[PDB]
Amino acid sequence: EVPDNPPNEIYATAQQKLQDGNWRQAITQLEALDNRYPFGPYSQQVQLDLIYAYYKNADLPLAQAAIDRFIRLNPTHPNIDYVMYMRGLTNMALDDSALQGFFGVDRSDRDPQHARAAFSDFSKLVRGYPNSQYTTDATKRLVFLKDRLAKYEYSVAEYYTERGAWVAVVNRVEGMLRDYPDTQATRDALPLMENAYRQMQMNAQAEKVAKIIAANSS
Amino acid sequence: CSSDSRYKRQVSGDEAYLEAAPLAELHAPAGMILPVTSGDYAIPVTNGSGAVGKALDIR
Amino acid sequence: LFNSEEDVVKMSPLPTVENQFTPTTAWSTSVGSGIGNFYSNLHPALADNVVYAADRAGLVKALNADDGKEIWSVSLAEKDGWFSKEPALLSGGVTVSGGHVYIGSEKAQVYALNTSDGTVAWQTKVAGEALSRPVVSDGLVLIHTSNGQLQALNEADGAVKWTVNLDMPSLSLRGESAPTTAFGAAVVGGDNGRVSAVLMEQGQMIWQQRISQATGSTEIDRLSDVDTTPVVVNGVVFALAYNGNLTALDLRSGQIMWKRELGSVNDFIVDGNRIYLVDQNDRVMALTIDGGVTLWTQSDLLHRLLTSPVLYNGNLVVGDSEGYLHWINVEDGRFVAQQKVDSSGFQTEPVAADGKLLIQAKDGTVYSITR
Amino acid sequence: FVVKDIHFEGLQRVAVGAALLSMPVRTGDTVNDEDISNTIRALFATGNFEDVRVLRDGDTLLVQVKERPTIASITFSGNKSVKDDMLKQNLEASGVRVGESLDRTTIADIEKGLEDFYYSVGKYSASVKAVVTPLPRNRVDLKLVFQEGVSAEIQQINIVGNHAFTTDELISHFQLRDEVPWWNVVGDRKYQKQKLAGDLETLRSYYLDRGYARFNIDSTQVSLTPDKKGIYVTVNITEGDQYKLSGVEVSGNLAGHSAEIEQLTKIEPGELYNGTKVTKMEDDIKKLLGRYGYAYPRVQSMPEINDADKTVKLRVNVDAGNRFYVRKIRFEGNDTSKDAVLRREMRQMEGAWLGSDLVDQGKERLNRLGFFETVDTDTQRVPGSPDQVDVVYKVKERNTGSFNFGIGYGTESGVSFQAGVQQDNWLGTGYAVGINGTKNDYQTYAELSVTNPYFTVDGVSLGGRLFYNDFQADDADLSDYTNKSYGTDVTLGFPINEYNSLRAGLGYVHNSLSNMQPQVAMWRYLYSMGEHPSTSDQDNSFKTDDFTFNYGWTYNKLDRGYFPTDGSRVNLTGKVTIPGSDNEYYKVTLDTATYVPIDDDHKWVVLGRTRWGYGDGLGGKEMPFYENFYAGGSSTVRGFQSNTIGPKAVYFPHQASNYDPDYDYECATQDGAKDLCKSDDAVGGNAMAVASLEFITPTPFISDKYANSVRTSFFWDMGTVWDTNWDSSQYSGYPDYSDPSNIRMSAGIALQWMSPLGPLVFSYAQPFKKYDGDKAEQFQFNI
Amino acid sequence: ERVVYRPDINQGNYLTANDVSKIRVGMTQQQVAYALGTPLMSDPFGTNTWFYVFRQQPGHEGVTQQTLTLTFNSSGVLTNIDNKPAL
Structure with a gap:
């Protein structure tokens, strides 16, 4: 780290390596300010810069620790709307970050444990700060984060359909129908619960879906 | 390490977020309607403005 | 590995080996492998030129206190235990009262051996082995056992008179109290830092005085079975607490005459008004009886597991678990004779009776000592 | 006495106004001399102010405070194997840390709980010294010195109330042993009371299943022995009067x-x-x-x-509960893998009742996977009806893929190198991706092996394997052994049972040869091929298109798919040729691997790794001699070198290889030895029987963050490779290999270590039965 | 298909014929739910039909199934015990 200096001597050197993007040297600086002044004049905005430095340096629990620090430090702040965005933004990075993106592989057949967390914080942003500069951003994420659950819930509804566990087809597909009407994974799962019924001899109950198939054909 | 690695950053993907879910909403007949927002799905469509994604700036 | 493993604490073993008085052994009369590493209050008795000596391996003798000649010999390596032919393994000391040799064994068994030949006068399994040496008196084989029980048997068959826990050791908290009979009352210390008077007749608590700290929440000595044995100088009970804390106090109530509640003391004798001690670091000091006021001190022997300080040939004789013998000035503090008779070390009680000094090392066993 | 100014001296973490709000009197609030003394205790009530001197200049408060905070570091000296965070947990329990209020008085209760830490360990031959090292503006370093001599050791157990069963055999029964003879080592032992707490319960079950059902252990007295190590135990029990x-x-x-x-x-x-x-x-x-x-x-x-x-x-x-508890199931830890590939590895089904043995068997398929770290779950009984359990399968996945490389100092003999890469779990799809080969002057090789394991959900293992060996043996590349080897095999896994699986594949062996070596069994096989090439020359070329049929079957009852400990997996590998092949033959091969845990903790496990094979012709037409069996090197036998175990090829009076490098790479040629010689590498036998005896062993010096990534396994290798048609009339100054008696032998240990791209295994093996041509390098390091 | 062996399939949550005797048309869903619990499939948009269906496949010889759906009214009073056998 950097020893006990003036707070801005640590900070302006930290402010360089954020502008330089040298987060591993910025985190070498930014903690060294809060090593000596965690109450200091920058230490409130160090944490925001730390969530800026850590998450850019893939220190994602450390960013989220710096969030929960700043949650415990400043339960309100002019940059909690930053932080409540930054919670879900790290949580989106917490969810799906594999190298298979350049090879063209879906990662919403993969566990959205942290997109679920990102669904919370982005919605806690657009509720708790419904007009911030991050609110307009995180609102559209949430609809796609709904779709990220949708393709994930389609991935298992795919699985049970080819499994032919038509009870488990129904309960998964009804879960999609509890969750969202809007994605195409709604209307593509729509005949599959209808498929489950004819396979479970609930043809008349499949006709009730066939009405919805008729009504939500368009 | 001690070398030119030529990558250090960590961002959250693209704006497929801003390429958000399509519209295939409930038009089901009578006796066929059921709740479709159950879950964490509480998204107030709040376009209180400000930049987005890579244009959105964070520190 | 073994060149580098240890971070142990020092000793000051032995400056001023003196031979002003010439020290020696009277002879050597080794009984085999007695105490060994298995520490015990087992020690022989010396009277009538009869070294009633035994080793824990089984061989129970009467040796002579003229040459170590077998006055008798039997064996307690017998069919006792879960297996036939298993050793003596004695907890209690070699108590002769009348024509019986009463010895508490570590097998929670108490014997009587006929002192003329060592043949079994009686045998009795007891409740817990003897933490202290068998005090066999009033027909009552009064023993503070390792479970803190004031137990009395009969001294003619071993018929148990009672068994009463006085101060319960919490794990096996080593408060060594010999059950002392004084004024018709059973006067026993404590395993957890107490001291008591109980009725000698059947075990009825006259009082028990809570004295000082025990193992837990103020963590104290484990490096000694602390001599909480009450020395009832008639009105005044002299004992340690289980942390070593010295207290002089009433026999009938436990009300304090004076106390040295700072103690760490291992062994203690009241040599008139010059109370001689063995501290936890085995620093030596000579204390009064109206306080524990120092008459002299000695730090020469230090961190050596000494014996009880005894006076033989006019000097303060102290053995050790180094097998060395030391004749301290009963005056101000320093060595008058110093002997090595042994290296296998003394966990015994020095018996300066029958003209000799009777000690027995752990495996370098019984050495008749004179100067 | 209303205050005009309060003097806030020496605070350094608590702010000047944060000092002010902690005061019972504020600047402008009426100051009492009681409230001066209340200002003494309230700033003492912060716990950050070691000294507080509330004074006033008549009424102008002058509050001289000395302050406890930041402990800027905590140093651990004398910090032997009882490690320091748990010693810092003694500080963390007392609210003490780096960046902390330091009451400089609290040194002893630290060193109490530091020695009470040893007391809970069972050590007391230890001395702890919390030393304060002051740092700027008040600050402090906690340099901590530990004089840790030695902990307590098991010495003796005596049991009273026990008269039937001997204590010493129960001492050996439970963790009470301390006896390591000078002629006998049964390990080494040490004390902890938590062992003995369990050893009571082993003893509790002991007289229980004898029948003693008034059996009770009354109490237990481990003596507080004057050595601070002496575990001399007095146990009080009631035997219990067998019922x-x-x-x-x-x-x-x-x-x-x-x-x-x-x-x-x-x-x-x-x-x-x-x-x-x-x-x-x-x-x-x-x-x-x-x-x-x-x-x-x-x-x-x-x-x-x-x-x-x-x-x-x-x-x-x-x-009983109710039947249809398994409403649905949940899965956690599938953030990189295809979940449905994992979800199809279960037998307990959503929307029905429970089979208790379906889940762990489903967990066993996930345990037989290999690319996992954990196969756990959470049996979340959903609150509600008696049909609501949603079993939340938490799992943890592992690193996949592997690289391997030999040696050879490239871009010096031309830009030439050895290749081979594996992925095996292709982007979490489970696609078995492993591709090998090499680009060299002496030969050119590529080989792919790709499997869609679930082409259909039956476990339809769409395993396509291709290879292409452009072998030339470039000394002239058309004087030594040239070979355009290439061909295909797709192979598929077939369900027999849920642990039994059949396999079958197809053979296309398109090899094109030239300039072949003057040796017997090369020509002798060619004479069974109906060819009669020259013996005294390497003048002969050969195309084959061998059309075989492959088959196999898999046993799978063995625990982990990557690091198992108990059980076995048997896997038949054989082939037969078909009508249309260029040579009528077969070769069937079988290797065995069982896991027999010596330890019941399974830290020591026998691994019986054996190898068996026999290949022969289908009458007249023979098995090709490159399909002979071999051993040595690092294959499963080490110390020896690769393919140095087996029959040795016998050379010929021969001049022209069509080129020999001038007294280099000799083949009994024009550059000397124009006579029946014998080469030193094995040409190998038509039979295989070799085995290796491996023994899992734990390590006491490696932390288990990666000691579980390390398999120290000792071997003693043995075996022969021998040709059941190797003659003595044709090999007369040359060894016979038609009896299984050429039994090579070696021993040593394997050094397994998991990299981020899988295990890296190494060895040092000493051969002990050596024969003709048993080439050896005793050190073996694999990737 | 040419193979006969199959890794045979499962998934009941049905009602036995004993369970038909446990309840009757007219009982509440709760009156079923005391005796039978709820099924792992119920009516999500219509009147309460408690779908208890068995499934099982024998190897290359059909599929065995026992369907039993319990159409209650909206009040919960049972209105139909609709049991179906295989096919």
Whole structure:
């Protein structure tokens, strides 16, 4: 780290390596300010810069620790709307970050444990700060984060359909129908619960879906 | 390490977020309607403005 | 590995080996492998030129206190235990009262051996082995056992008179109290830092005085079975607490005459008004009886597991678990004779009776000592 | 006395106004001399102010405060294997850390709890010294010195109240042993009371399943021995007067499975009591009711131990749950893998009842996976109906893929190198991706092996394998052994059982050869090929297109797919040629691998790794001699070198290879030895019988963050490779290899270490039975 | 298909014929739910039909199934015990 200096001597050197993007040297600086002044004049905005430095340096629990620090430090702040965005933004990075993106592989057949967390914080942003500069951003994420659950819930509804566990087809597909009407994974799962019924001899109950198939054909 | 690695950053993907879910909403007949927002799905469509994604700036 | 493993604490073993008085052994009369590493209050008795000596391996003798000649010999390596032919393994000391040799064994068994030949006068399994040496008196084989029980048997068959826990050791908290009979009352210390008077007749608590700290929440000595044995100088009970804390106090109530509640003391004798001690670091000091006021001190022997300080040939004789013998000035503090008779070390009680000094090392066993 | 100014001296973490709000009097609030003394205690009540001197200049408060905060570091000196964060946990328990209020008085209670830490360890031959090192503006370093001599060791156990069973055999039975003879080592031992707490319970079960059912351990007295190590134990027990298991009175909600219960309560009414099997047999019901769906099979046994006839009677109170508990199931830890590939590896189904044995078998398929770290779950009984359990399968996945490389100092003999890369779990799809080969002057090789394991969800293992060896043996590349080897095999795994799996594939062996070596079994096979090439020259070329049929079958009852400990997997590998092949033959091969845990903790496991093979012709037409068997190197036999075990090829009076490098790479040629010679590498036998005996061993110096990534396994290798048609009339100054007696032998240990791209295994092996041409390098390092 | 062996399929949550005797048309869903619990499939948009269906496949010889759906009214009073056998 950097020893006990003036707070801005640590900070302006930290402010360089954020502008330089040298987060591993910025985190070498930014903690060294809060090593000596965690109450200091920058230490409130160090944490925001730390969530800026850590998450850019893939220190994602450390960013989220710096969030929960700043949650415990400043339960309100002019940059909690930053932080409540930054919670879900790290949580989106917490969810799906594999190298298979350049090879063209879906990662919403993969566990959205942290997109679920990102669904919370982005919605806690657009509720708790419904007009911030991050609110307009995180609102559209949430609809796609709904779709990220949708393709994930389609991935298992795919699985049970080819499994032919038509009870488990129904309960998964009804879960999609509890969750969202809007994605195409709604209307593509729509005949599959209808498929489950004819396979479970609930043809008349499949006709009730066939009405919805008729009504939500368009 | 001690070398030119030529990558250090960590961002959250693209704006497929801003390429958000399509519209295939409930038009089901009578006796066929059921709740479709159950879950964490509480998204107030709040376009209180400000930049987005890579244009959105964070520190 | 073994060149580098240890971070142990020092000793000051032995400056001023003196031979002003010439020290020696009277002879050597080794009984085999007695105490060994298995520490015990087992020690022989010396009277009538009869070294009633035994080793824990089984061989129970009467040796002579003229040459170590077998006055008798039997064996307690017998069919006792879960297996036939298993050793003596004695907890209690070699108590002769009348024509019986009463010895508490570590097998929670108490014997009587006929002192003329060592043949079994009686045998009795007891409740817990003897933490202290068998005090066999009033027909009552009064023993503070390792479970803190004031137990009395009969001294003619071993018929148990009672068994009463006085101060319960919490794990096996080593408060060594010999059950002392004084004024018709059973006067026993404590395993957890107490001291008591109980009725000698059947075990009825006259009082028990809570004295000082025990193992837990103020963590104290484990490096000694602390001599909480009450020395009832008639009105005044002299004992340690289980942390070593010295207290002089009433026999009938436990009300304090004076106390040295700072103690760490291992062994203690009241040599008139010059109370001689063995501290936890085995620093030596000579204390009064109206306080524990120092008459002299000695730090020469230090961190050596000494014996009880005894006076033989006019000097303060102290053995050790180094097998060395030391004749301290009963005056101000320093060595008058110093002997090595042994290296296998003394966990015994020095018996300066029958003209000799009777000690027995752990495996370098019984050495008749004179100067 | 209303204050005009409060003087806030020496605070350094608590702010000047944060000092002010902690004061009972504020600047402008009326200051009492009691409230001066209240300002003494309230700034003392912060716990950050070691000294507080509230004064006033008549009324102008002058509050001289000295302050406890930041401990800027905590240093641990003398910090032997009882490590320092748990020693810092002693500080963390006392609210002490780096960046902390330092009450400089609190040194002793630290060193109490530091030595109480050893006391809970069982050490007391230790001295702890918390030393304060002051740092700027008040600050402090906690340099901590530990004089840790040695902890307590098991010395003796005595049991009173025990008269039947000997203590010393029970000492050896439970963790009470301390005896390592000078002629006998059974390991080494040490004390901890938590062992003995368990050793009581082993003893509790001991007289239990003898039948002693008034058995109770009264108390236990480990002596506080004047050495601070002496564990001399006095145990008080009640033996317990052996009682006989003499009746079952099972009752309660038997759920209509009372007979199925009754077989589980089929006992001998009058045999000596075994509460341990009684404890077991209750679980047998719970699996059985768990097999029936009842995941709440509440079973309450009750021993009516009848001491009037010295017996036991056994009331059992049963309460099943309900059947259709498995509403659905959840899966956690599939953030990189395809979940449905994992979800199809289960037998317990959503929307039905429970089979208790379906989940762990489904977990066993996930345990036989390999690319996992954990196969766990969470049996979340959803609150609500008696049909609501959503089993939340938490798992953890592992690193996949592997690289390998030999040696050869490239871009010096031309830009030339060795290749081979594996992925095996292609982007979490489970696609078995492993591709090998090499680009060299002497030969050119590429080989792919790709499997869609679930082309259909039956486990349809769409395993396509291709290869292409442009072998030339470039000394002239058309004087030594040239070979355009290439061909295909797609192979598929077929369900036999849920642990048994058949395999079958197709053979296309398109090899094109030239300039072949003057040796017997090369020509001797070619004479069975109907060819009669020259022996004294390497003038001969050869195309084959061998058309075989491959097959196989898999046994799978062995624990981990990557690091198992108990069981075995048997995998038949064979081939036969078809009508249309360029040579009529076969070759069948079989290797065995069982896991026999020496330890019941399974830290020591026998690994019997054997290798068997026999290949021959289909009459007249023969097995090709490159399909001979081999060993040595690093294959499974080490110390020896690769393919140095087997029959050795016998050279010929021969001049022209069409080129020999001038007295280099000799083949009994024009550059010398124009006579029947014998080469030193093995040409190998038509039979294989070699084995290796591997022994898992734990390590005491490696932290288990990666000691579980390390498999120290000792071997003693042995075996022969020999040709059951190797003659003595044709090999007369040359060894015969038609009897299994050329049995090479080696021993050593493997050094497994998991990299981020899989295990890196190494060895040093010493060969002991050596024969002709057993080339050796005793050190073996693999990737 | 040419193979006969199959890794045979499962998934009941049905009602036995004993369960038909446990309830009757007219009982509440709760009156079923005391005796039978709820099924792992119920009516999500219509009147309460408690779908208890068995499934199982024998190897290359059909599929065995026992369907039993319990159409209650909106009040919960049972209105139909609709049991279906295989096919």
